[PDB]
A and B are shown apart, each in its own frame.
Chain A
Amino acid sequence: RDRRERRLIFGTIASKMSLAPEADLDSLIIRNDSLSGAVIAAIMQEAGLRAVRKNRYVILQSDLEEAYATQVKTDNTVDKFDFYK
């Protein structure tokens, strides 16, 4: 992927959802590496799932960052080096 090329996915999903003006879209394109639109769409969708937990219809910057750490990796077996080979 590319930093600017992925932004087409970020900007498209963000147009169909409500986001605060303090939300930084450049922090997602730099940190994410080799990911598809399905993972990106789950980030903005989790932001709404984190918003309904707080009973706030407007997604703020806090709900955007808290939703990124959950959807960044779906693999539970990662660990780090714990099991060699």
Chain B
Amino acid sequence: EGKIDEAADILCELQVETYGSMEMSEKIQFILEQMELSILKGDYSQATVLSRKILKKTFKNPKYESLKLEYYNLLVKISLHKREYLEVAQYLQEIYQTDAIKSDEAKWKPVLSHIVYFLVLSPYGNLQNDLIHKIQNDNNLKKLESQESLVKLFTTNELMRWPIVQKTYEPVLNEDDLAFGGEANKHHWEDLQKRVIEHNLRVISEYYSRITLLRLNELLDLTESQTETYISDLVNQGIIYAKVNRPAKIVNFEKPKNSSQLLNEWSHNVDELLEHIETIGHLITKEEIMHGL
């Protein structure tokens, strides 16, 4: 009949007072329907509470095929209201190994690009390095090396070929009809471009210590007003730090002076004075071996 809120309210006001926690077969399956009705209704609070209840009960119980595959789709659907790709990237780690063991490479290829698409949108964290190799990678495939290069793209990104790669290969990128909610494709260009700029300013601070603001706008794919916009956002959020001179138009790294000068930074020369006697001790022994033998 086309009812959404009526089917959700009637099912929640009954099923909660229905089951006495006796038979967990039809109980777990029908609770998952309560979460699907809350997503179509648009209530994020109802889907969050239901996702924290039977999630741990399923893991403690023996593993089932049709039951565990439903959680993988539901944890992705909550990204519509949440709009956070860091949490949904960890939820796909189980389905990544599920299609690689129980299923075949037919279903393993699409889930490979979805977990990488959610990984490249993550703001920060050290888990991005451990997800480079993964498990089943190094299969010598076109879609495997394409998504794997996107993770390593954060190391060198000039944003010159960024619009070219997205328009050429766009399995999950520009047009994605699977595991992505939205009313149009406008969210693909906005969400992806804002994240790659955040990862751009991180590596540039570790490479160019002092750079002119005029030449900096070409490397970051930004204008004069857009350059200072992303710089001030990362500093306020506690990401990186840099030097921005408005009248001088010079961007520096702002090296910290808190290292106590020669008390710490100079201590890096201990390896210079230490290896002297190590090479002499090895040379005297080496010269006597070839001379006696």
* A70 → chain B closest CB, angstroms: 20
* A/B pair count, beta carbons within 8 Å: 9
Residue total for A at the interface (Cβ-Cβ under 8 A): 4
Residues of B141-183 whose CB lies within 8 A of A: none
Q: Does any Cβ of A come within 8 Å of B135's Cβ?
A: no
- Among the listed stretches A3-11, A23-31, A50-58, which one makes contact with chain B, having 4 or more residues with CB under 8 Å of it? A50-58
A56 to B53: give the CA distance in the assembly, Å: 7
Q: Give the residues in chain B near A57, CB-CB below 8 Å.
A: 49, 52
Residues of A12-55 whose CB lies within 8 A of B: 55
Q: Give the residues in chain A near B49, CB-CB below 8 Å.
A: 56-58
* B14 → chain A closest CB, angstroms: 15
* A52 → chain B closest CB, angstroms: 11
A55 to B45: give the CA distance in the assembly, Å: 14
* A54 → chain B closest CB, angstroms: 8
Q: Which of A55, A56, A57, A58 has the most CB of B within 10 A?
A: A55
Q: Residues 42-60 of chain B: 1 if any A CB is under 8 Å from the residue's CB, otherwise 0?
A: 0001000100110000000
* B165 → chain A closest CB, angstroms: 42
Q: Residues 20-49 of chain B: 1 if any A CB is under 8 Å from the residue's CB, otherwise 0?
A: 000000000000000000000000010001
A55 to B28: give the CA distance in the assembly, Å: 14
Select from chain A the residue with minimum beta-carbon distance to B48: A58
Q: Give the residues in chain B near A56, CB-CB below 8 Å.
A: 49, 52-53
Select from chain B the residue with minimum beta-carbon distance to A58: B49
Q: Give the residues in chain A near B53, CB-CB below 8 Å.
A: 55-56
A58 to B45: give the CA distance in the assembly, Å: 9
Q: Give the residues in chain B near A58, CB-CB below 8 Å.
A: 45, 49
Known A56-B52, A57-B49, A58-B45; 6 more pairs at CB < 8 Å: A55-B52, A55-B53, A56-B49, A56-B53, A57-B52, A58-B49
Q: List 9 A-B contacts (CB under 8 A).
A: A55-B52, A55-B53, A56-B49, A56-B52, A56-B53, A57-B49, A57-B52, A58-B45, A58-B49
Kindly list the 6 A-B residue pairs having the minimum CB-CB distance in the complex, ordered from nearest: A55-B53, A56-B49, A58-B49, A57-B52, A56-B53, A57-B49
Give the interface of A toward B (CB within 8 A): 55-58
